[PDB]
Amino acid sequence: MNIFEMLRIDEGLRLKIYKDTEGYYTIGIGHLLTKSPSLNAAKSELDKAIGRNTNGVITKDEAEKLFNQDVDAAVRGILRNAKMKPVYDSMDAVRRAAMINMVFQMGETGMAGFTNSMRMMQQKRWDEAAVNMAKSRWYNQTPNRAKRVITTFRTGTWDAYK
C-alpha cells in the first residue's frame, strides 16, 4: 500500500465528467474541475487540463496523468504551508500518507479547521486526535472515507485499507 493506491481506493476512477459528493464536476481520480454549476465551464476546464478537445471524456492514461500531478501538488502544498509542514515532518510515513489524503480531498483551506487535531497529532496523541477529527463536517459528509483515514492516523498502519 501507498498514497496512490490509497487514494485510488478512496476516490475511484471515472472517465466521464461526473458530480462529486458536494455536486462539483469532477473527472478521473477525484480531480475537481470546477465549483461552478455549468457543465460547459467544466468541459472547458477539462480541455484546458488535458490539452485537447475532450468532449467530457478522457482515457485511463490521461486520468492517471492528472492524478500524478494532483498528488504531487498536494505534497508540495503541505511543504509550503508554514502551519502544516511541521506536522507533516514530525510524522512517520503511513501517517504522512493519511495527511496527504485529507489535503487532496479538502485542499489547504478545508485543512484549516483541523488546527486542533493537527496539534494533537504533532504531540503524538493519536487517539484524542482521532476523536477530535470525527467532530467535523468532513466526517459527517463522507463517513466511511473519513473513518478509514482516521484509523490510519490512529494506528499508523494500513489496516483500514486491507
Of these residues, 20, 70, 108, 128, which one is catalytic? 20
Question: Is 20 tagged catalytic?
Answer: yes
55, 4, 3: which is closest to 27 by C-alpha?
55
Please report how close the Cβ of residue 68 comes to Cl ion at its closest, in angstroms: 11
C-alpha angle with apex 34: 31 to 35, nearest 5 degrees? Answer: 120
Q: Which residue from 58, 95, 133, 145 is in contact with Cl ion, where contact means CB under 5 A?
A: 145
Kindly tell me which of 145 and 154 has the beta carbon lying closer to Cl ion.
145
Distance CA 139, CA 121 (A): 17
When binding is defined by CB under 5 A, the residue of 142, 147, 156, 158 that contacts Cl ion is 142
Binding mask 44-73 for Cl ion (x = CB under 5 A): -----x------------------------
DSSP code at position 142: S
**Binding site feature residues for substrate:** 32, 104, 117, 132
CA-wise closest residue to 34 among 16, 20, 53: 20
3-state secondary structure 23-77: CCEEEECCEEEECCCCHHHHHHHHHHHHCCCCCCECCHHHHHHHHHHHHHHHHHH
Query: Of 91 and 130, which CB lies nearer to Cl ion in the complex structure?
Result: 130
- Indicate whether 148 belongs to the interface with Cl ion (CB under 5 A): no
Q: Give the residue numbers annotated as catalytic, written as ranges.
A: 11, 20
Q: Which residues bind Cl ion (CB under 5 A)?
A: 49, 142, 144-145
